[PDB]
Design a protein around this ligand. Structure first.
Ligand code: CLA
Ligand code: CLA
Ligand code: CLA
Ligand code: CLA
Ligand code: CLA
Ligand code: CLA
Ligand code: CLA
Ligand code: CLA
Ligand code: BCR
Ligand code: BCR
Ligand code: PQN
Lengths: 99, 79, 121, 49, 665, 253, 69, 66
């Protein structure tokens, strides 16, 4: 994990025993396992810290492409395009005067 | 290994499908009904089980039932 | 080899130490209109809270406990719950109108799911 | 079916009884006063609902 | 706090939340189960902390959705509406912030609302709401829309953040004392005081100027100035036909003060009877218990809103905007019914998942007496109608129950407003008129009581017999939503609380349809209409006062209400205004009939038909590996119920709205 | 207690002493060792094992804010009196006694009385006690009904019941019948009431011929003889009561 | 057009032969089949003639058993 | 369908057996009331549906053609 590289991540057993500062000069952070699939680990601060904690989610173009490949998005896009095409045909050639 | 013996067809198993013969009581319970029992001092009880000489309802349908089985089809061992 | 318990008629056994501590409800058997009963007797190492098949909850005595119901279905459901609690000594009896006691559920003393010798299809 | 001598907290039957008696005594005095005042001064304690 | 675990990888898994969906897509039942259990956060993978996380974040996301909808309403009012024409002359111009395209001749839907505007007449009362709020400019409406969109974005951000801010240690959602105190003092008390301030400082001057006739920008940008000593509600704005907005502002100030006082006495512990409610406090600290209680509270408040929005006029010109008041009443009554059946459902779920209260231990007497009261109420109330029908058909009106014949006077229906004699009118319309109660009102009210009691019977039976019953003793093991226990013991169809709701919804819909018809016919016959000239007016009502004479018979309901008043919707095809309403009438009839398919048929026939059909696909090598399956039993019931209710509601909606639109224009 | 490491010298900032005492009192004793995951005590244990003397003596502002958000305040936990009241309630219900309450408007009131909910037969749902059926007044009233009264012959029972039934039955037809406004309203109502008495007595005869109740029968008598006698005398009494009501109506207008 | 839709679809199903591909569409292959379905008349007649369209009824489930086995 | 109605019938039977006078005469043992079986209810609902549908037309045709 690149986000926490250079951070001193102490287990709860070592809390207070380790006081070495981080690469960013922050104090060590206590890491705990939560047994939650959504948040497997949570970190607490031993003191005031100056560190980057991104709130944006990690989204990959491959993941987005897989989600759109899901049959629902594929067929919904197909049906939306078809409905738009029929509506535009009705707009451009109303009343079927050619027939 | 079932002690029950089928009355209708000895080769087959008993319809009950049990393996231990029933236990008869020392004295069978006698027919009773729940009624009031005025206490003779102004009191009165609500559900007092009191003896009843015969069937509470003498209909043939009621009296034909012996409780031996679903159709009273269990042999003498049922009692 | 199996011994059938006395299991006195519920109308005769008004108060017994065996009966577990339960709340009571209108879901119990109708005493005025029915006479056939089913008794379930088990032994518990500790008082575990359990749900009566007839309405509310109950607390089983440490030692011998006895309960009365109207249907083998109620007795068997309570027995399944006891088995979940790891009480394997429970027995079920059918009580006729006249007091005859018929040992029913562990018919041969071995639970039906477990194979036993002397059983024929 | 009542158990007056029950040592539970939810056994305020004495409270209920005393409430009954006090309200009844007050109502006795009130009704006698209303009747007397109506007979004397024609005042029946008109209510302004 | 750790946002590195939120990735779009799970978006394509489609079923990660439910462990029972691990064997992905072996049949179409898998798709249906995915959808059914999508939002059942309790049975999903995770922990209680995750359940709380999902519940709160979903609440915030729905808040954002509602804010988006409100912002869209404001935008439509600002840019796609005739609000300017309506404000200057509300009577002549019908409200319309709704415009349709000219795709396939669809421009016919737009109807004449003003000289320069053509569109669809709206019935939500949003124009009256804006007028009450003091919104009189496109800029004001635009900034309201901007505020709504900003609130939408804020709520969306809050949901996304709280999905990770709240950890397994999070417990702020279990602080019921803090939650209730904060909501009572700030959300309600301070909210009401602040809205009273808003009214006093913005709406009162603007509304007074509008009533006078002033439309000056400088004025638009001295309380109790015009209100006399007359009790509020006893004197309506002569130029607007609604309660004085200064009286409304004083009401909100008083309500906020009362809420703050209640909160403060609770804070000081002045309330003493805590023990009487301690049992409920311990028992009902559950998601579903709170959901049921809140749903019932909001259902009752919605019904009270439906009644008061019409009986007590507070919005400008909403009293004379007959389509608006009718639609508001009907909408809020329907919401009341739906949220009440919801409360029943989640009460059943709470009973299944948690220990019930001790009133479940004498459930047999409760439901038995409810059954008896339902039977007696239905017998008497509906058999009075049947007696009237039979006797009138035989030719003996003197033997029927009516005002002229045997009459059932509602002695207990007594006045409390103490209004002055007469009616209140505003520009050729009856803004307010006393409703006179007689035999017809007696009969219809007892029909209402009967239907309410039967719906309550179904819901209460489902709640009380959820854990077990004489029939099946392991209903708790079976769960909440199962189709049956089997064909045994005679047959155990629809023994589940889910099915009890499935029937209570039918009964709620029946009750609400009767309520809607009663309100509609009574208002048309005895309240709404015009007048023809101390002055005495002869009031010409839209239905001509036929409720009191014809409503006493089911034939009268069928003829004078459905057949007679369906002339507008049935003959709406040529008319540009309501041709859409006629088509929706027809389509709703179709959908309602189509629901009977699922309501009557069964799973096995369709499964066998699907297999026979799939034979040909396999023959031609069209092998769908998501094997087609017939809808489950519970799903078939749900689909049938949804289509049934939607079709019935659509028919009623189109019928009433067409009638009102045509009559008022 | 002293044997619990994390409960020793918990810093005041993490949790106040009084609130900690209240939380321990509220929590079951057996859970102090290792509380379940979703409990205030579990949160306190997890955070006291990491923070306090001999450990991290500082916390980030946001971490401390969240800790104070998710730890309980004093007023959130139950009081001694509240816990006692709840325990007494549960003990009563489990013992089979019910703190009497009557439903009111969207709720129920507590009358302050403790009743014996369970009857003589504990497992019998027919025997649960209620004032309506098991009170002294109700017992005496039902026992003194004609159907039940002691020392009554079946003919006496039937005669009294029928007198009552016919006497009240004539009235509905007299007042609300088709001929209620005609001069023969009372007589037509009497005829209709006698017809109703006859129909119900025929139904009772069918009941006694099919089910044959034997509670009124004398010893050594045909089954259902007493019941049939009672039903016949109910028919007689219904005729008599209907006639008496009609006579009173006619004589006194 | 309808034969185009049917052919495309049948061709995707034959090419994929997997419930996982049925659920998560292989969009490249799906588009390829959609484009290829334009010659469906000739392709379908050729497959019908050559026996690649229909399989013998003995290779598929006939239905429920109507007699004793 | 049948389960709801069977439970309702059970409650009604409980009320009848708890009624003071009726219990001492009617045990419920003979012809014990029960909810209609699944097939019985299917048939009864079909009969009601058919009767209503068929019999509501002749009145209409007579009214319109007379
Ligand atoms: C294959 C189907 C199809 C075709 C051939 C067209 C063709 C056209 N559309 Mg489009 N349109 C379609 C689908 C289609 N549309 C759909 C599904 C929608 C619903 C959103 C629309 C909604 C729409 C609007 C509202 C407008 C057009 C317009 C137009 C014209 C210019 C191109 C454009 O703006 O495309 C837009 C195509 C889209 C799919 C919209 C994108 C939707 C979101 C943002 C996803 C990206 C052109 C005649 C514009 C025009 O020239 O009007 C005079 C115009 O005003 N279309
Ligand atoms: C709780 C009961 C009760 C209450 C609340 C009252 C209240 C009242 N009584 Mg009293 N009154 C009562 C019992 C009560 N009475 C009884 C029991 C009697 C009978 C001895 C009377 C006989 C009585 C008389 C004769 C008079 C009053 C009067 C009054 C008034 C006295 C206050 C005043 O002067 O102004 C007041 C309405 C006086 C009054 O103004 O009556 C209208 C008055 O003259 N009362
Ligand atoms: C409750 C929410 C809501 C609802 C029900 C509607 C409904 C409508 N809006 Mg919209 N609208 C909303 C919110 C909402 N709006 C908001 C929040 C804004 C901005 C604040 C707008 C801004 C807006 C404009 C500017 C216009 C509409 C219009 C319309 C109408 C036609 C939409 C259309 O052609 O879509 C076309 C179909 C699609 C876009 C396809 C959607 C799905 C694909 C994937 C994209 C329709 C009645 C139009 C209208 O009334 O014209 C007369 C119109 O011009 N709306
Ligand atoms: C129903 C509405 C609601 C409720 C009840 C809460 C509740 C909470 N929010 Mg807030 N929050 C909301 C809406 C709401 N939020 C919205 C819409 C947003 C998006 C702007 C946020 C964004 C947000 C953040 C970013 C944070 C909170 C935090 C908090 C906590 C309160 C501490 C605080 O700063 O209080 C004073 C007000 C608590 C979990 C803080 C927290 O949990 O800190 C530990 C925190 O960091 N909330
Ligand atoms: C400053 C005082 C004040 C004022 C001016 C109003 C004004 C109003 N209230 Mg009231 N209200 C107040 C205080 C006030 N309220 C307080 C303190 C509460 C308790 C929280 C309420 C609770 C309340 C409710 C629950 C409702 C109203 C409603 C109303 C409206 C119609 C009332 C009516 O016609 O009554 C007629 C007047 C009388 C019968 C005279 C009696 C006056 C007192 C009791 C003497 C009106 C805007 C109704 C509403 O909003 O309808 C849309 C409504 O449903 N009010
Ligand atoms: C969800 C809807 C709902 C609503 C609107 C109410 C409304 C009410 N309940 Mg509640 N209650 C509900 C559901 C509801 N209850 C449920 C589901 C239960 C069963 C557990 C109860 C059990 C209950 C009890 C035990 C009591 C109430 C009481 C009350 C009243 C409290 C306010 C009061 O007395 O003010 C007036 C005071 C100034 C009020 C009428 C109290 C009451 O008096 O009820 C008759 C009361 O003691 N309710
Ligand atoms: C629906 C019409 C109806 C029915 C079903 C009956 C039924 C009966 N009537 Mg009749 N009765 C009727 C109308 C009817 N009555 C009318 C309108 C009158 C005129 C007031 C009478 C006057 C009448 C008399 C005076 C007597 C009967 C008696 C009887 C019984 C005749 C069989 C018998 O001996 O049983 C044996 C029981 C039976 C209970 C007899 C009776 O009660 O016998 C005990 C009897 O004495 N009825
Ligand atoms: C003591 C009881 C009693 C009394 C006082 C009366 C009194 C009356 N009955 Mg009789 N009646 C009685 C019992 C009684 N009835 C009973 C038990 C029945 C049921 C069979 C009837 C059925 C009956 C009918 C059907 C009629 C009377 C009528 C009369 C009137 C004239 C009777 C007469 O003189 O006949 C003398 C001959 C003997 C008179 C109001 C008649 C009348 O005038 O009605 C308005 C009439 O039509 N009664
Ligand atoms: C104690 C007493 C009493 C009692 C009573 C009773 C107990 C009654 C009962 C009764 C009854 C118990 C009755 C019965 C009835 C019946 C009915 C109502 C029937 C019906 C039927 C039907 C409906 C059928 C039909 C049919 C035919 C015929 C043929 C074939 C087909 C069918 C099935 C359809 C009295 C009041 C007298 C008086 C006082 C004393
Ligand atoms: C709950 C309630 C109630 C109720 C009541 C009732 C239910 C009543 C009843 C009543 C009745 C129901 C009555 C009756 C009476 C009767 C009578 C009074 C009769 C008499 C008779 C006679 C006298 C007869 C005689 C004779 C005979 C028997 C035969 C031969 C001939 C001669 C004539 C001799 C009330 C309303 C109060 C109100 C409160 C509550
Ligand atoms: C019809 C029916 C089916 C068969 C119905 C099925 C399988 C539903 C078909 C689902 C389709 C594939 C979903 C796609 C949506 C529609 C095709 C949309 C049509 C929209 C129109 C406007 C074109 C059941 O399985 C069933 C089960 C239990 C009780 C009743 C019934 C029942 O009534």
């Amino acid at each position: 994990d690149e986000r926490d590289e250079g951070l001193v991540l102490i287990t709860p057993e070592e809390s207070g025993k380790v006081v070495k500062r981080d690469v960013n000069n922050n104090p060590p952070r206590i890491v705990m396992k939560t047994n939650d699939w959504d948040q497997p680990e949570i970190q607490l601060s031993t003191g005031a810290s100056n560190q980057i904690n991104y709130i944006t989610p990690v989204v990959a173009s491959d993941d987005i492409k897989a989600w759109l490949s899901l049959n629902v998005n594929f067929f919904s896009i197909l049906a939306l395009l078809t409905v738009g095409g029929i509506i535009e045909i009705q707009r451009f050639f109303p009343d079927t005067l050619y027939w | 290994s079932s002690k029950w013996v089928n009355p209708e067809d000895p080769e087959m198993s008993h319809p009950s499908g049990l393996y231990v013969l029933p236990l008869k009581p020392a004295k069978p319970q006698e027919n009773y009904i729940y009624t009031w029992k005025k206490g003779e001092d102004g009191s009165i009880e609500d559900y007092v089980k009191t003896p009843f000489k015969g069937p509470e309802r003498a209909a043939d349908y009621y009296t034909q039932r012996k409780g031996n089985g679903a159709w009273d089809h269990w042999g003498p061992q049922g009692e | 080899e199996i011994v059938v318990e006395s299991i006195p008629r519920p109308e005769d056994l008004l108060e017994s130490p065996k009966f577990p501590m339960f709340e009571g409800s209108t879901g119990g058997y109708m005493s005025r209109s029915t006479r056939e009963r089913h008794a379930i007797t088990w032994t518990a190492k500790d008082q575990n809270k359990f749900e009566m098949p007839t309405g509310g909850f109950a607390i089983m005595n440490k030692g011998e406990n006895l309960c009365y119901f109207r249907k083998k279905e109620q007795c068997i459901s309570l027995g399944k719950q006891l088995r979940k609690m790891k009480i394997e000594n429970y027995k079920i009896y059918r009580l006729k109108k006249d007091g005859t006691v018929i040992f029913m559920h562990p018919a041969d003393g071995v639970f039906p799911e477990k194979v036993n010798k002397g059983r024929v299809q | 079916i009542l158990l007056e001598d029950e040592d539970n907290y939810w056994n305020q039957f004495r409270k209920a009884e005393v409430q009954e008696l006090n309200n009844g005594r007050l109502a006795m005095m009130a009704i006698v006063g209303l009747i007397v005042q109506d007979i004397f001064f024609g005042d029946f304690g008109e209510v302004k609902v | 706090a750790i946002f590195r675990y939120v990735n779009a990888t799970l978006w394509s898994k489609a079923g990660h939340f439910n462990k029972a969906l691990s064997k992905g897509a072996k049949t179409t039942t898998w798709i249906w189960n995915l959808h059914a259990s999508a939002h059942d956060f309790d049975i999903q993978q995770g922990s209680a902390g995750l359940i709380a996380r999902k519940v709160f974040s979903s609440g915030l996301a729905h808040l954002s959705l509602v804010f988006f909808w409100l912002g869209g309403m404001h935008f439509h009012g600002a840019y796609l509406s005739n609000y300017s024409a309506w404000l200057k002359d509300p009577k002549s111009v019908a409200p319309s912030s709704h415009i349709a395209y000219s795709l396939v001749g669809q421009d016919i839907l737009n109807s004449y609302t003003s000289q320069y505007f053509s569109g669809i007449t709206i019935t939500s009362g949003f124009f009256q709401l804006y007028r009450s709020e003091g919104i009189v400019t496109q800029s004001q409406l635009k900034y309201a829309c901007a505020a709504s969109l900003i609130a939408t974005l804020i709520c969306l951000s809050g949901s996304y953040l709280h999905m990770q801010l709240m950890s397994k240690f999070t417990s702020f959602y279990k602080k019921f004392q803090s939650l209730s105190q904060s909501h009572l003092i700030i959300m309600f008390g301070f909210g009401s005081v602040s809205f009273s301030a808003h009214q006093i400082h913005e709406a009162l001057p603007i509304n007074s100027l509008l009533d006078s006739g002033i439309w000056d920008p400088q004025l638009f940008s001295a309380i109790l100035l015009g209100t006399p000593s007359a009790i509020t509600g006893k004197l309506l704005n002569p130029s607007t036909g609604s309660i004085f907005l200064s009286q409304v502002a004083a009401h909100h100030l008083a309500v906020g003060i009362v809420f703050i006082t209640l909160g403060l006495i609770k804070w000081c512990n002045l309330f003493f009877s805590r023990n009487a409610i301690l049992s409920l406090r311990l028992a009902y600290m559950d998601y579903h218990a709170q959901l049921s209680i809140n749903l019932a509270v909001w259902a009752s408040l919605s019904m009270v809103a439906a009644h008061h929005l019409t009986e007590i006029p507070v919005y400008p010109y909403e009293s004379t905007d007959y389509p608006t008041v009718l639609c508001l009443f009907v909408h809020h009554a329907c919401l009341s019914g739906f949220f009440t059946v919801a409360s029943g459902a989640h009460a059943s779920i709470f009973v299944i998942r948690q220990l019930p209260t001790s009133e479940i231990r004498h459930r047999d007497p409760i439901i038995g007496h409810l059954i008896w009261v339902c039977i007696a109420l239905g017998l008497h109330s509906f058999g009075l109608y049947c007696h009237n029908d039979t006797l009138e058909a035989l030719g003996r009106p003197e033997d029927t129950f009516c005002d002229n014949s045997i009459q059932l006077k509602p002695i207990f229906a007594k006045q409390f407003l103490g209004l002055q004699p007469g009616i209140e009118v505003l520009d050729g319309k009856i803004v307010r008129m006393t409703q006179e109660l007689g035999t017809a009102d007696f009969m219809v009210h007892h029909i209402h009581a009967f239907t309410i009691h039967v719906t309550l019977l179904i819901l209460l039976k489902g709640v009380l017999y959820a854990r077990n019953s004489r029939l099946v003793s392991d209903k708790l093991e079976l769960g909440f939503a199962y189709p049956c226990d089997g064909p045994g013991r005679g047959g155990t169809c629809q023994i589940s609380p889910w099915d009890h709701l499935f029937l209570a919804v039918f009964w709620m819909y029946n009750c609400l349809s009767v309520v809607i018809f009663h309100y509609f016919w009574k208002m048309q016959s005895d309240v709404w209409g015009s007048y023809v000239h101390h002055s005495s007016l002869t009031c010409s009502h839209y239905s001509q006062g036929d409720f009191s004479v014809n409503s006493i018979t089911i034939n009268g309901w069928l003829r004078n209400l459905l057949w007679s008043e369906a002339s507008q919707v049935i003959q709406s095809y040529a008319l540009p205004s309501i041709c859409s309403y006629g088509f929706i009438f027809l389509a709703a009839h179709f959908v309602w009939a189509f629901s009977l398919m699922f309501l009557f048929s069964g799973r096995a026939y369709w499964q066998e038909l699907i297999e026979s059909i799939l034979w040909s696909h396999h023959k031609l090598k069209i092998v769908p590996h998501i094997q087609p399956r017939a809808l489950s039993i519970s799903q078939g019931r749900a689909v049938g119920l949804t289509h049934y209710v939607l079709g019935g509601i659509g028919c009623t909606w189109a019928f009433i709205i067409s009638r009102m639109l045509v009559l008022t224009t | 207690i002293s044997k619990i490491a994390y409960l020793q010298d918990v810093p005041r900032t993490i949790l106040e002493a009084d609130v900690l005492e209240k939380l321990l009192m509220n929590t079951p004793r057996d859970q102090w060792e290792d509380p379940p995951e979703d409990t205030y005590l579990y949160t306190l244990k997890t955070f006291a094992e990491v923070y306090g003397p001999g450990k991290a003596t500082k916390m980030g502002w946001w971490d401390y804010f969240r800790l104070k958000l998710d730890l309980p305040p004093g007023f959130e936990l139950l009081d001694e009196d509240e816990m006692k009241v709840a325990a007494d309630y549960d003990k009563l219900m489990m013992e089979g006694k019910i703190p009497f309450a009557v439903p009111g408007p969207a709720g129920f009131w507590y009358t302050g009385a403790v009743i014996q909910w369970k009857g003589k037969e504990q497992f019998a749902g027919d025997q649960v006690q209620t004032l309506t059926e098991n009170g002294r007044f109700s017992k005496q009233f039902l026992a003194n009904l004609a159907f039940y009264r002691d020392g009554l012959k079946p003919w006496q029972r039937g005669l009294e019941i029928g007198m009552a039934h016919g006497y009240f039955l004539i009235g509905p037809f007299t007042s609300l019948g088709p001929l209620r406004n005609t001069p023969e309203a009372a007589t037509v109502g009497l005829l209709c009431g006698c017809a109703i008495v006859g129909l119900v007595s025929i139904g009772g005869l069918i009941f006694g011929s099919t089910i044959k109740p034997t509670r009124f029968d004398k010893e050594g008598d045909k089954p259902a003889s007493g019941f049939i006698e009672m039903i016949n005398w109910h028919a007689i009494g219904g005729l008599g009561g209907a006639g008496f009501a009609h006579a009173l109506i006619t004589v006194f207008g | 057009t309808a034969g185009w839709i049917g052919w495309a679809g049948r061709s995707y199903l034959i090419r994929t032969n997997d419930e996982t591909k049925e659920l998560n569409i292989d969009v490249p292959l799906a588009l390829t089949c959609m484009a290829s379905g334009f010659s469906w008349p000739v392709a379908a007649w050729q497959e019908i003639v050559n026996g690649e369209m229909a399989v013998p009824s003995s290779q598929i489930h006939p239905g429920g058993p109507y007699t004793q086995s | 369908w049948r389960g709801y109605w069977q439970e309702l019938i059970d409650i009604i039977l409980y009320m009848h057996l708890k009624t003071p006078i009726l219990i001492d005469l009617w045990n419920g043992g003979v012809y014990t009331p029960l909810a209609l079986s699944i097939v019985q209810a299917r048939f009864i609902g079909l009969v009601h549906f058919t009767a209503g549908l068929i019999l509501t037309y002749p009145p209409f045709i007579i009214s319109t053609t007379s």
